């Protein structure tokens, strides 16, 4: 199997809603040890987002059952812990791909890729933080903030305020402050600043991405409305 067939397999797996297969295919593509195209980047992200998302959804269901309820609670807690370990394994898989391939071999001028991958790194440490406790949680919360903040600095310097990757970073970084750090003022400032910076430079919208830009601006406004 060559790279073209692996990417085709990922596309087929996505259509069949077999996201474990999709992630394995795109992990294999990454492990060819060459950079990812924009499409390969998106396929990798979609794959792992859906894999981890199934675990996140299941974890929230079992955690809610654990709060609402002898050998029964022992099984509920053990099952939650089983799902937790699966979720953590998926996140560490992604983070290893990011740290050892994707961020590692980014060129100096590939600012969009660096922001994309650093945002992903922030995302997956944030998913770890959702289920972590104690000192383990403090470590992954710190790692999430470090990745988001570096992505934010790079995107501030090298990307237009309407660029959809910069806007989506602000969206998720603000969510990190609201949900993980319990810091609604900082979350609102991040979201409002990104929205305002985009609307002030509306003339920088690109023909190939203006739909994503304007939609993510609405998602930012949605969260600000919910939070204020």
């Amino acid at each position: 199997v060559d790279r073209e067939q692996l990417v085709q397999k990922a596309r087929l797996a996505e259509q069949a809603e077999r996201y474990d297969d999709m992630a394995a295919a795109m992990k294999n593509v990454t492990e060819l040890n060459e950079p990812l195209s924009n499409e390969e980047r998106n396929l990798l992200s979609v794959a792992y987002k859906n894999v981890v998302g199934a675990r996140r959804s299941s974890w929230r269901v079992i955690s809610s059952i654990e709060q609402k309820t002898e050998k029964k609670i022992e099984m509920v807690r053990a099952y939650r812990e089983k799902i937790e370990k699966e979720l953590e394994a998926v996140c560490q898989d992604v983070l290893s791909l990011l740290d050892n391939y994707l961020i590692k071999n980014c060129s100096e001028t590939q600012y969009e890729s660096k922001v994309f991958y650093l945002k992903m790194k922030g995302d997956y440490y944030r998913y770890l933080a959702e289920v972590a406790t104690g000192e383990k949680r403090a470590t992954v919360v710190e790692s999430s903030e470090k990745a988001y903040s570096e992505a934010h600095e790079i995107s501030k310097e090298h990307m237009q305020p309407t660029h959809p990757i910069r806007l989506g970073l602000a969206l998720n970084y603000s969510v990190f402050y609201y949900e993980i750090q319990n810091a609604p003022e900082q979350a609102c400032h991040l979201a409002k600043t990104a929205f305002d910076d985009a609307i002030a430079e509306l003339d920088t919208l690109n023909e190939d991405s203006y739909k994503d830009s304007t939609l993510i601006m609405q998602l930012l406004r949605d969260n600000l409305t919910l939070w204020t």
């Binding site: 924009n38 499409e39 998106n42 992200s45 979609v46 995302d123 959809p164 990757i165 989506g168 969206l171 998720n172 969510v175 609201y178 949900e179 190939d208 991405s209 739909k211 994503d212 939609l215 993510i216 609405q218 998602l219 949605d222 969260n223 919910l226």
Partner: peptide, 22 residues
Amino acid sequence: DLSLPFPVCESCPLYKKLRLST
């Protein structure tokens, strides 16, 4: 979930992005 719900790429139809966002 309040985070980015869709992939940022043109090959994903807008209708899909709107459904993921709502």
